[PDB]
Design a protein around this ligand. Structure first.
Ligand SMILES: OC[C@H]1O[C@H](O[C@H]2[C@H](O)[C@@H](O)[C@@H](O[C@H]3[C@H](O)[C@@H](O)[C@@H](O)O[C@@H]3CO)O[C@@H]2CO)[C@H](O)[C@@H](O)[C@@H]1O
Ligand SMILES: [Zn+2]
Ligand SMILES: [Zn+2]
Length: 500
């Protein structure tokens, strides 16, 4: 990392241009150049890159990612004077505390709200249950009731949580990573309601961020679910919009997961002092936050003095009312696994690839561990057995595949299980995304597991199948490295799984 300057990473939906202006003031005052960048998948890139001591000096993201960053020792400890701490709301500091240490600066507080087109819908619906009938009305005029991003569990979670869904139960002073509320009766109800909106053609499974945004900002749909960052583009459109409380579901409020946008400092940064000066005395000020806010709205902010200005805005009170009805996201390392698990269940259920029950049962298993994967894919009959994950009976092809792939029967509470292809593939996909491997040679693998390559059990990172002697030799012969993932596990690619 270059010494004498600041590189800052922040997400593309945020006011990076405004932040750049703060960055130019810092430069005019100190002579230090600040470069603001908005890399795709920055939150996944940061941990790969920072582990080798590269990356940005400062990284911005909601607080939920930061526990994982801190655990891996990627973040500098933040030590602001008590005077400074007093400038921000206490709960925001709590969001960036990990094992008794402050690991980032809180910037702003974020919650989803219902955004609606006053001209098309002067009085927005109070319940999710009214949408179906309302959509029918609007379709008559070539419009739709509701579009929003269904690709990200962040947007669908408020509904899933409404009737009892939850991530980790908080108890005995800590989130209990073994008590996950992802396949309880309330989650199923909420996901079932969502899936029925899709079967009945009130929404498309394919809708993503860009598609819902365009549709709303061009007057084609009456409602959308988004955060404060989205308001700036609606302003610039012809749309006359309101911001209000999310609908209820079975008479219970929708429960958004509340994020605190936070700025962490790379442990490997040689510019820690400069980073702290920038953040404390330039960004976390009335003028600094306003510069960023004018670009893309921040939502409620952590800085008391400026939040007082922002609080007069009805869109902000609506933001805070939805926030009070939701929960502050946990920052524990297990959150990544939770988010991936739910993302997959929603995508699967919405396309009909799996039932709601199957999809949530798998999500439940994935959110609470990966011990099951290791048991199934141990180093190295299935017919009539169910899938460990989704609890559905293995078809006879999936039973065959379990055998040919050289899987191991998993016993849970006395019962024997295999895995269907869908759950197995989703699980391995999450492994690659959650544990970026480092490349290793055959020699490195042999040395690590005191065993010749022909005798090492190396599995395909896509299908879980045990690589043949020739498949392993392919890696060596053609200079294609193996992958060292978690627990010193070594993965490779079978002939069939050699993507372009
Ligand atoms: O879906 C897989 C996804 O899971 C995790 O992403 C979550 C974020 O960690 C979490 O903060 C939240 O992201 C939202 C931001 O808070 C908000 O400011 C704005 O940017 O919208 C974001 C949602 O798109 O929720 C997501 C889950 O949807 C994980 O960190 C990701 O790496 C992973 O891709
Ligand atoms: Zn399954
Ligand atoms: Zn394979």
């Amino acid at each position: 990392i270059e010494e004498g300057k600041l590189v800052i990473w922040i997400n593309g939906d945020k006011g990076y241009n405004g932040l750049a202006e703060v960055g130019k003031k810092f430069e005019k005052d100190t002579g230090i150049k600040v470069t603001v960048e908005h890399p795709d998948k920055l939150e996944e890139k940061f941990p790969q890159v920072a582990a080798t001591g590269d990356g940005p000096d400062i990284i911005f993201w909601a607080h939920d990612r930061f526990g994982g960053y801190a655990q891996s020792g990627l973040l500098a400890e933040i030590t602001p004077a008590a005077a400074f701490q007093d400038k921000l709301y206490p709960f925001t500091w709590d969001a960036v505390r990990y094992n008794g240490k402050l690991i980032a600066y809180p910037i702003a507080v974020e919650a989803l709200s219902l955004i609606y087109n006053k001209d098309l819908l002067p009085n927005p619906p109070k319940t999710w249950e009214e949408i179906p009938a309302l959509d029918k009305e609007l379709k008559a005029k070539g419009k739709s009731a509701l579009m929003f991003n269904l690709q990200e569990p962040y947007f669908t979670w408020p509904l899933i949580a409404a009737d009892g869904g939850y991530a980790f139960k908080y108890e005995n002073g800590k989130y209990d990573i073994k008590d996950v509320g992802v396949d309880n009766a309330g989650a199923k109800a909420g996901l079932t309601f969502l899936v029925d909106l899709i079967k009945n053609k009130h929404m498309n499974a394919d809708t993503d961020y860009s598609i819902a945004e365009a549709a709303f900002n061009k007057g084609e749909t009456a409602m959308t679910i988004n955060g404060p960052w989205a308001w700036s583009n609606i302003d610039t459109s012809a749309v006359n919009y309101g911001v209000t409380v999310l609908p209820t579901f079975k008479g219970q409020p929708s429960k958004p997961f509340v994020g605190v946008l936070s700025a962490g400092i790379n442990a490997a940064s040689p510019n820690k002092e400069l980073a702290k000066e920038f953040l404390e005395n330039y960004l976390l000020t009335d003028e600094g936050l306003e510069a960023v806010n004018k670009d893309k709205p921040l939502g409620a902010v952590a800085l008391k003095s400026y939040e007082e200005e922002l609080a007069k805005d009805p869109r902000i009170a609506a933001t805070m009312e939805n926030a009070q009805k939701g929960e502050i996201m946990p920052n524990i390392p297990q959150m990544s696994a939770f988010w991936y698990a739910v993302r997959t269940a929603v995508i699967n259920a919405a396309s009909g690839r799996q039932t709601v029950d199957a999809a949530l049962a798998a999500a439940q298993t994935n959110a609470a561990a990966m011990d099951d994967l290791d048991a199934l894919l141990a180093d190295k009959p299935f017919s009539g057995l169910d899938c460990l994950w989704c609890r559905e009976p293995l078809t006879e092809v999936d039973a065959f595949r379990c055998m040919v792939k050289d899987f191991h029967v998993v016993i849970r509470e006395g019962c024997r299980y295999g895995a269907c292809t869908i759950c197995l593939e989703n699980c391995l996909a999450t492994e690659r995304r959650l544990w970026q491997g480092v490349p290793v040679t055959g020699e490195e693998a042999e040395l690590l597991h005191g065993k010749t390559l022909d005798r090492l059990c190396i599995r395909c990172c896509y299908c879980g199948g045990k690589l043949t002697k020739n498949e392993k030799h392919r890696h060596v012969l053609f200079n294609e490295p193996f992958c060292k993932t978690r627990a010193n596990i070594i993965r490779g690619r079978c002939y069939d799984c050699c993507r372009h």
